[PDB]
Amino acid sequence: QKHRVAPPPHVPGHLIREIDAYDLDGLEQGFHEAWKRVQQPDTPPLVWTPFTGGHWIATRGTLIDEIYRSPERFSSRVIWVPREAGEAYDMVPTKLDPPEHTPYRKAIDKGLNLAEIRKLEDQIRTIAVEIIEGFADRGHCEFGSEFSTVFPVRVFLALAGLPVEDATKLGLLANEMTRPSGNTPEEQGRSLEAANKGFFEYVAPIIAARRGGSGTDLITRILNVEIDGKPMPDDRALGLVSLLLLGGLDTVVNFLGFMMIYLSRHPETVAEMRREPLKLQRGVEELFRRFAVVSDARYVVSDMEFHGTMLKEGDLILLPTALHGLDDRHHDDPMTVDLSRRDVTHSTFAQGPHRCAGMHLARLEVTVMLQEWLARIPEFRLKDRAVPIYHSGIVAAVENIPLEWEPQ
Numbered sequence: 001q002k003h004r005v006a007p008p009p010h011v012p013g014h015l016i017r018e019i020d021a022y023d024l025d026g027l028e029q030g031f032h033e034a035w036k037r038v039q040q041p042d043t044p045p046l047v048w049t050p051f052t053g054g055h056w057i058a059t060r061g062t063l064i065d066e067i068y069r070s071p072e073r074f075s076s077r078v079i080w081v082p083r084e085a086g087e088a089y090d091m092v093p094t095k096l097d098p099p100e101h102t103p104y105r106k107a108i109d110k111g112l113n114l115a116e117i118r119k120l121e122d123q124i125r126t127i128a129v130e131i132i133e134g135f136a137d138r139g140h141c142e143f144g145s146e147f148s149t150v151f152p153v154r155v156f157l158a159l160a161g162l163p164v165e166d167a168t169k170l171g172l173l174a175n176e177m178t179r180p181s182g183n184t185p186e187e188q189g190r191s192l193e194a195a196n197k198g199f200f201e202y203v204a205p206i207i208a209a210r211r212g213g214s215g216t217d218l219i220t221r222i223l224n225v226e227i228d229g230k231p232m233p234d235d236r237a238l239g240l241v242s243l244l245l246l247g248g249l250d251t252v253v254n255f256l257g258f259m260m261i262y263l264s265r266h267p268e269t270v271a272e273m274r275r276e277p278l279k280l281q282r283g284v285e286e287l288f289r290r291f292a293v294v295s296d297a298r299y300v301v302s303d304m305e306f307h308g309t310m311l312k313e314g315d316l317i318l319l320p321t322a323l324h325g326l327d328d329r330h331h332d333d334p335m336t337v338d339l340s341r342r343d344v345t346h347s348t349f350a351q352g353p354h355r356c357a358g359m360h361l362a363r364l365e366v367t368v369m370l371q372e373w374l375a376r377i378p379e380f381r382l383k384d385r386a387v388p389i390y391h392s393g394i395v396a397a398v399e400n401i402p403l404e405w406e407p408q
């Protein structure tokens with residue numbers, strides 16, 4: 001049973017579209033495919049759905065890019081739908097606009113900048129190799145449970161100086177953050193609230209212990225960056241460390257599954273990567289263009305007209321980042337991975353002040369994964385008649401990816 005809200009007076013009927021971000025029409029055929037259905041050749045750049053509490057959806061790449069770049073007009077004070085979940089959401093600095101956002105992003109960048117990330121390459125590689133060598137000779141694996149949900153999680157927990165045995169409870173919190181349970185805005189609000197509380201509970205003692213700490217881990221490094229010449233307050237720290245865990249554990253995991261499904265169905269593309277190692281390295285960004293997973297929102301700051309549509313202060317606009325990288329108006333044949341594509345522009349990492357702090361880590365993880373995978377499992381296919389199971393929400397997910405190959 002679908003929960004509908006009535007449209008507010010300023011939304012005209014001709015812009016209404018019944019789109020459910022948490023269970024997209026056509027989702028069974030794929031998350032990206034399902035979002036692509038929304039983007040028909042004549043659909044308005046902004047449409048409004050009565051589902052998920054009622055909100056706008058930007059349907060074209062340049063709107064998504066522009067909105068992300070314009071925090072003075074589109075605020076991060078709510079970035080989740082439904083509104084109830086967005087209001088309960090308590091992560092730092094994603095809830096902040098500049099200038100409040102700025103010193104916290106600086107602190108994060110101390111830990112996640114490209115030069116710091118580069119130092120991590122061999123640890124990441126070691127982790128990838130160990131996992132791959134566990135099944136490489138077997139000739140088959142369930143990629144989701146045996147790799148994609150394992151590799152990035154071990155990478156991040158090691159980097160964060162946390163026990164790997166916490167992976168399960170943290171993954172469960174992550175699920176209810178990005179894909180909250182419930183068939184009602186209030187239910188989803190409550191699911192998110194409880195998940196966000198679980199993160200704060202887990203994170204509090206770690207913060208207490210590592211303040212002024214000597215540890216070399218990501219959390220200690222970032223925690224002890226001063227904010228305006230003072231220790232980071234408790235309220236902000238809780239939201240900050242929770243966000244690190246959330247990004248580190250429930251992004252790359254999902255990205256990898258979508259990517260691998262595609263690769264397993266395009267052996268020519270895999271062959272190219274194999275034969276030209278530089279095509280692989282330089283081609284990773286094209287993968288990020290093609291396999292966006294995040295759909296989040298911004299809060300309309302003032303009554304305005306935007307791309308010919310009237311918006312009211314407080315309106316939420318969902319930004320399905322897949323609709324930038326896959327916009328046929330930005331990229332010819334957007335659904336094909338072309339490793340040589342010169343223009344790979346996308347909003348997979350969003351834009352503006354909040355542009356993904358973890359993007360260097362994400363790029364390295366994927367680059368290393370592909371290098372060590374192809375070295376040991378050069379050819380592979382999706383099992384005959386296998387059907388991956390897809391989930392849509394603030395972050396997309398996919399499971400059931402049985403791969404098969406002839407051991408080399």
Ligand code: HEM
Nearest residue numbers: 093094244247248251252255294349350354356357358362
């Ligand atoms: C496939 C990989 C990833 C994707 C697609 C992705 C996507 C995004 C997006 C779209 C945003 C902007 C959210 C918004 O403000 O509306 C973001 C921000 C952020 N991400 Fe990533 N992310 C990925 C990996 C990571 C990783 C591994 C981390 C490690 C901690 C991370 C940490 C962060 C942080 C801390 C922010 C907030 C930055 C700020 O508000 O200034 N991300 N990410």
Ligand SMILES: CC1(C)[C@H]2CC(=O)[C@]1(C)C[C@H]2O
Nearest residue numbers: 091094178246247251294296
């Ligand atoms: C939307 C995000 C992917 C982004 C901000 C969030 O809350 C995430 C779920 C983790 C971080 O990387």
